[PDB]
């Protein structure tokens, strides 16, 4: 597995990704408050997601983009973490949405991954 | 209108593009033989085309990418001109297919524009 510290809106978070076969496991944790948001996504779900943005990606390609954003080893992919306030403005209430932002010359695509609160 | 000389497989061609409202006009000409291939595409057709590749583009964005490839002012878009031999291998007989090749970090997309022989 891969585990990195990543800063979302000033707050360092612990992020864990697990890719095993055709399923993607993701965990975001605020260590100070012990808050955790976790999501499980299979290849079918991911491809439905990327297709809906009009910028399709294979599941294995999406997972690599996700890792490249996390390790900050790629210039076109980045991460953000949105609350429920950010989404209803864009369109419990403890859910978070990890956004994979794909920025290239003629595209800016947002791939949203919903992470229920734990 | 825009008119540039562009080399396809070693042969310099004359290319003319005309964007007027929501229709795209394209002409490729071999001056030595006076051969011309011309295509007319409306915004609806272009968007059906880009959507089918899984990498959607708005009509006005597609036209700009097309011009950037022609003037060679962009690092992600390039052109090629395919005959009917190249396509049946990939899958009258005088038709040509202008391919807009979109190359970014996690995508390589081919947008094919069919140009009937004149």
Author numbering:
A (entry chain A), B (entry chain A): 6 to 96, 114 to 140
Quote the paper.
The highly conserved coiled-coil domain-containing protein 61 (CCDC61, also known as variable flagellar number 3, VFL3) is one of these understudied proteins. Here, we identify CCDC61 as a highly conserved paralog of SAS6, a key organizer of the central scaffold around which centrioles are formed (Leidel et al., 2005). Our crystal structures of CCDC61 demonstrate that it adopts a SAS6-like fold and forms oligomers through two homodimerization domains in a similar way to SAS6: an N-terminal globular head and a parallel coiled-coil domain. Further analysis of CCDC61 reveals that its coiled-coil domains are capable of directly interacting with microtubules.
To gain more insight into the domain organization of CCDC61, we determined the crystal structure of the N-terminal domain of human CCDC61 (hCCDC611−143) at a resolution of 2.6 Å using X-ray crystallography. CCDC61 has an insertion of an extra α helix (α3) followed by an unstructured loop between β5 and β6, which are unique to CCDC61. The conserved phenylalanine F128 of hCCDC61 (asterisks in Figures 2A, close up in (i) and S1B, dark blue arrow in the alignment) makes van der Waals interactions with M70 and V82 lining a hydrophobic pocket of the homodimer partner that is constituted by α2, the β hairpin of β5 and 6, and the turns before and after α2 (Figure 2A, in (i)). The dimer interface is further stabilized by an extensive network of salt bridges and hydrogen bonds, including a β zipper formed by residues found between α1 and α2. To test whether homodimer formation of hCCDC611−143 observed in crystallo is also observed in solution, we studied the oligomeric state of the protein using analytical ultracentrifugation (AUC). This analysis suggests that hCCDC611−143 exists in a monomer-dimer equilibrium with a KD of 170 ± 18 μM, suggesting a relatively weak binding affinity, similar to that observed with SAS6 (van Breugel et al., 2011, Kitagawa et al., 2011). It is worth mentioning that the head domain of hCCDC61 contains a conserved surface area that is not directly involved in D1 dimer formation as described in Figures 2A and S2A.
